[PDB]
């Protein structure tokens, strides 16, 4: 769930990420969403 939210906000360019799927109040990400995505995807 958190990974989905981070993926939506963050640019999808993580080396490990490159699969991706697309389906149809915001979430605040305390650091930049890119760092959270990088630290969470592993």
């Amino acid at each position: 769930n958190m990974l989905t939210e981070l993926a939506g906000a963050s640019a999808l360019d993580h080396p490990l990420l490159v699969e991706v799927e697309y389906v149809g109040t915001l979430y605040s990400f305390e650091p930049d969403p890119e760092t959270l995505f990088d630290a969470l995807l592993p």
Partner: peptide
């Protein structure tokens, strides 16, 4: 990795 956004 599910993404809740429309396809590009």
């Amino acid at each position: 990795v599910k993404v809740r956004k429309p396809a590009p």
